[PDB]
């Protein structure tokens, strides 16, 4: 994929002031919560204690016929970038390194009111940057309608329900359930926020730009007389 | 402290006790899971609007268009900045007199013109969505948290100010009022500066149309009583601006020697 | 059968017919609008003669209202977007032959000062005159609600002559 | 490496116990030969639905239809290309003024787009045809094929290249999106610059109809997808291209501050 | 023209007789699902066979059979060039009306005698 490894450039936005946002769009930055699980948001977006960046694009349902405004349920994706070690002491964020990936977890939320269903998806990538093949450590979480309850482990059983790892499930041909999830889901889901990433930087980046020229052209209206 | 750097309204997940509550409700509902269902009496299934996931997607439906009304207005301000730059980078070679500058002149003035209350009706259809959607959560406890008064505050302030610019002073009376009234906001200077210019247009259709002496005491009264308060707001008591509001606003009215 | 599915088309075009006809009212009074613009756009009248057409616009555009609320055929509203396409809350199907499955459908469109474009469907303020400005624009505001209004009797009239071919047939 | 240079989807024909197995059946068949046998039930000969020798066929008709399609295109310019040939070469002796030239230039204009349009709706209907054939095949180990995703994407551009000449623009959705599913064609500037196009039609219908916000948004969003793609895959990212494109979309997309 | 096409469409799928299909193309001449057999005779192999071809917006050429698009008179180009798509829509309808009446003038000297 490799594509983790660009994830990695994406520590620039810790000490950038993040002004510029999308429509439905979330970001902050924070450090780990208890266990790791998720990110807590700072006081401060500036300080260099922020290893976690947290991405969100929510959405509501019914918005693919017109009746978004309809309040017929909600839905969000998120995803959260995990750091390890402190950031670097110079306070300008355009030079910094790119730093090894902790976790890359993502979140699906799709609830109808309607319907009264819920579908809740958790993907927690452990071991983004160090090998190509870690499917032993890509840990998935479904769960629907509240059941199972959070963090029960998957049962023989009962393939696929509650807190499981990508090395379960089988990938042969009858059932190539892991090359879909690879060719479906997770490389698309990884560009689709890796370029997020990337246009949220550029725009704020941008902004330094206006700034300056500002200035200039504020000096420039003395030369009339 | 950004209240809206989450974009939501409330957090959602703790006794073993209300833990066991919850596991034989959901296997209650697993015995009479029918999606098909549909309520004759909607009574029951009213109480969803009492629900943190309901009032949850209610303040993210008015946040979407909150971003969307606030968008109108400052796509609007570039485009009119870089409007009149291009103007001026053109060339007019069939230009020789000064009049004919001031022809050229007067078109960009109505270009802008035109744009610009386009730019405002669109900010109002959409800051008025965002503020029915506010309304139709019916939890108390809820509509007192620092998120909900963020945006409730802000909403407000983007409506009013779109509102004054397309000239409809007196809707911006009822507003400006619950506006005023939420945590801090009394303390803001341009909240009673706008009251002062809205009651004043409330007076003179009161005195143009010769309506009630009732209601023309009652609008000069609430339009001095907002001049003063924010000139209080801006240049202190007892400061020099403050004595002369004073002698305006004693000469405004009435007083019984 | 077949008897019965000619008194259905008979009673077919009878409703396609009423509806046709509430909106010749309609068009007319936009075009009495239209051309209250152009005299109103002039700029040697003031804003007291400019209110005063006005006073006209307010009596005219509440007229259009009461025209797609009244409008009925059997105790059923017609021009209030009840069998409008998008989203409907009732549909009309016309029964036209002798068999099972055998019925055709018809599409009212909301005929209102909302759906015209003349009315706000959020704010509820309709279009105004009294002032210079203002009704050079609404030139083109009635320039599109008569194209709505003219759209929509051509609809009406295509349902029509071909239940009049069905009821033939 | 050419996949349809071979000519056929898959080759269809070890273990001696395989061998035992086949002589034994083709003896039960032989028992009950009846050629005049027709099945009242269907679901046994639709199990040959999944057979090499059904899809086999079904890729030769196919591409007996593309074959066929591409000639109608060829043909059709290589007559184009005689037919403005004719017509500089003959003589003109009632011919000696500007718009007698002129005009008789308008003539072979719209003669050639009347030969032009209807050689794309003639070869469309070939195209068309061969996307019903090769959709029907229902073993998907021979859908993953090289000759298979060589002909699918080879008939899906010509049909999109054709649709698009006739300005059917929204019907080259569908289609164009199960051609960037196929192989690495996702990576071509062609396939994401029509999605551009036909998804800016999309955007103006729900303008002047006067749709949703979401509908309109939907296409808004998915036109800069698919023109910003096109854009880093003909001039790369950070180049003077790009930059240029990213103001036009920062311009029409929504912000917030 | 939305309308119209729609009615011809809905006249050959309603066309009956005694709970039979006429106008769907079942008893054409080329590819037919069912056969037409008038036993007019005595005997044991006296029976003549009747054709009806299909009458639907496709067969007539008012619609593409395959991507079940019709005709437009939205352009003037398109409007022109479907005048001589009615005029041979007319003259296919024009010489079944021929048929069938051949068929009926038969019956009525066969029944005659």
Known sequence: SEVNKRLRLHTVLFKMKVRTLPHKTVLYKGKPSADGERCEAADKQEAQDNTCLHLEVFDFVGS????????????????????????????????????????????????????????????????????????????????????????????????????????????????????????????????????????????????????????VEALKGSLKY | ??????????????????????????????????????????????????????????????????????????????????????????????????????????????????????????????????????????????????????????????????????????????????????????????????????????????????????????????????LLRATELKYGKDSPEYKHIVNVINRDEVISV | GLRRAEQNTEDGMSLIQTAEGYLQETHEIVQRVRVLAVQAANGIYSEEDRQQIQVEVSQLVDEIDRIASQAEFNKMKLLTGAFARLNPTASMWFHIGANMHQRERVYIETMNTAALGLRNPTVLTFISLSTAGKANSVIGLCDDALRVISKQRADLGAYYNRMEHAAKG
């Open chain 1, 64 to 215: 693919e016929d017109g009746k978004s405004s309809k309040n017929l349920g909600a839905k969000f994706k998120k995803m959260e970038l995990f750091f390890e070690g402190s950031n670097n002491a110079d306070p300008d964020p355009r030079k910094e390194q790119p730093r090894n990936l902790t976790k890359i977890r993502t979140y699906i939320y799709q609830n109808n009111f309607l319907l009264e269903d819920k579908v809740i998806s958790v993907i927690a990538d452990v071991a983004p940057n160090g090998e190509p093949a870690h499917n032993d450590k890509i840990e998935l979480f479904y769960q629907h309608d509240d059941y199972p309850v959070w963090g029960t482990p998957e049962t023989p059983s009962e393939k696929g329900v509650g807190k499981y790892i990508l090395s379960n499930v089988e990938n042969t041909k009858s059932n190539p359930i892991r090359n879909n999830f690879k060719k479906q889901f997770y490389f698309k889901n990884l560009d689709y926020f890796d370029k997020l990433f990337t246009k949220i930087f550029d725009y704020n980046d941008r902004d330094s730009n206006k700034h300056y020229k500002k200035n």
């Open chain 2, 1 to 226: 402290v950004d209240e809206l750097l989450k974009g939501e309204l409330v957090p959602e997940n703790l006794t073993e006790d209300q833990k066991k509550k919850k596991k034989e409700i959901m296997e209650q509902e697993s015995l009479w899971k029918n999606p098909d269902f549909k309520g004759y009496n909607k009574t029951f299934q009213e109480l969803h609007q009492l629900s943190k996931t309901f009032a949850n997607n209610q303040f993210r439906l008015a946040l979407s268009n909150y971003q969307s009304g606030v968008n109108t207005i400052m796509k609007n301000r570039d485009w009119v900045e870089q409007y009149r730059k291009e103007e001026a980078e053109k060339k007019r070679l069939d230009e020789k007199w000064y009049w004919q500058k001031v022809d050229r002149k007067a078109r960009e003035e109505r270009v802008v013109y035109r744009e610009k209350m386009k730019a405002k009706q669109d900010a109002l259809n959409y800051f008025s969505k965002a503020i029915n959607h506010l309304d139709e959560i019916k939890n108390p406890d809820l509509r007192e948290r620092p998120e909900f008064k963020r945006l409730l505050s802000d909403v407000y302030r983007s409506w009013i100010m779109a509102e004054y610019d397309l000239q409809n002073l007196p809707q911006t009376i009822p507003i400006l009022e619950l506006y005023i009234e939420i945590d801090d906001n009394e303390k803001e200077y341009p909240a009673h500066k706008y009251l002062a210019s809205a009651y004043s247009f409330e007076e003179n259709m009161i005195k143009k149309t010769k309506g009630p002496d009732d209601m023309l005491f009652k609008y000069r009264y609430k339009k001095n009583v907002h």
